[PDB]
């Protein structure tokens, strides 16, 4: 079975996987910011690490703009059965995002839980 997520739940689940980032990561997370899209262009796909150019690093006002990861409401909610199942999801896709975005593997991240 699959659980049926509405976008502004899912945007809660988001926030409730963000909470529960090992702090471990937390630091890696620094101007790292999660947007939620339906359907990747590749139907694999949970998430999507977006880096910034330098160039559009920065606003005019001085600002400076985050880093993305995608996730895909779809491909996640399909393979749960649950909220929290979702939560965990979303929670394993911005940790492994972020952690490959620093050079970090698959087996590292088993040494860290993931």
Known sequence: ???????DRF???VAEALDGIP???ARAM????????????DPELLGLYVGIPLTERTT?????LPDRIIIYRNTICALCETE????????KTVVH?????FGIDDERLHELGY
């Not at 929290?84 to 979303?90: C, L």
């Open 1 to 7: 079975g699959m659980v049926y997520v509405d976008p």
């Open 11 to 13: 945007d809660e689940l």
């Open 23 to 25: 702090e471990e990561f």
């Open 30 to 41: 620094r101007n790292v910011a999660v947007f939620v899209e339906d359907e990747p262009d």
């Open 60 to 64: 005019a006002y001085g600002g400076v």
């Open 84 to 91: 929290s199942e979702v939560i965990d999801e979303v929670r």
């Open 97 to 101: 995002e972020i952690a490959h975005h």
